[model samples]
Each structure stands twice: as structure tokens, then as C-alpha cells.
Target: RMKQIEDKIEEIESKQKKIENEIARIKKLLQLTVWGIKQLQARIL
Candidate 1:
């Protein structure tokens, strides 16, 4: 029973790490999108 609980805890830890990585990637994408929009606005004006 203890081993089972430990396994579940480990699994949750791994998932948490994956979620953090995805969030970082999404942040990078958003930053790029904002920069692109600014450039487009400058070109139009």
C-alpha cells in the first residue's frame, strides 16, 4: 500500500513538471505574437 502511494506521488510530480514546461512554452509563444503585432502596426503607419 505504501509503495502504491509512492508511485502515485511520483506520477503527480512528473505531470507537474510537464505542466510547467508547457506553460513556459506558451508564454514564449505569446511574447512572440505580441512582438509580431507591434511590428505589423508600425509597418501600417
Candidate 2:
């Protein structure tokens, strides 16, 4: 019973790590998108 609970905890931790990584990836994408839009606006002007 204790082992099962420990396994579940480990599983949750692994999932949490994956979620954190995905959030970082999304933040990077948004930063790149904003930079691209700024460049386009400058070119148009």
C-alpha cells in the first residue's frame, strides 16, 4: 500500500515537470511572436 502511494506521487511529480517545461516553451513562442510583429511594423513604416 505504501509503495503504491509512493508510485502515485512520483507519477504526479513527473507530470508536473512536463507541464512546467511546456509553459516555458509557450512563453518563448510568445516572445518570438511579439518580436516578429514589431519587426513587421517597422518595415511597413
Candidate 3:
């Protein structure tokens, strides 16, 4: 039973890592989008 709990804990830890990575990826996409909009606006002006 203890080992089973350990496995679950490790699973959660790995999942948490995956979520952090996804958050980082999303942040990058947002940054790129903001940058593109800025460039487009500059070109129009």
C-alpha cells in the first residue's frame, strides 16, 4: 500500500512538471503574438 501511494505521488509530480512546461509554451506564444501585433501596427503607421 505504501508503494502504491508512492507511485501515485510520483505520477502527480511528473504531471505537475508537464503543466509547468505547457504554461511556459503558452507564455511564449502570447509573447510572439504581442510582438507581431506591434510590428503590424508599426508598418501601418
Between candidates 2 and 3, which one is better according to TM-score?
3
Candidate 3 lDDT over 1-45, as tens digits, reads 999999999999999999999999999999999999999999999
TM-score of each: 0.89, 0.82, 0.83
- For model 1, how does the per-residue alpha-carbon lDDT over 1-45 read when each residue is reduced to its tens digit? 999999999999999999999999999999999999999999999
Model 1 worst lDDT window (10 residues):
1-10
Error of 2 at 7 (Å): 0.5
State the weakest 10-residue window (summed lDDT) of model 2.
1-10
Ranked candidates, highest TM-score first: 1, 3, 2
Q: After superposition, how far is residue 28 of candidate 1 from its true place, in Å?
A: 0.6
What are the lDDT scores of the predictions, listed in order? Answer: 1.00, 1.00, 1.00
In Å, residue 5's CA in model 2 sits off its true spot by: 1.2
Cα displacement (angstroms), candidate 3, residue 19, comes to 0.8
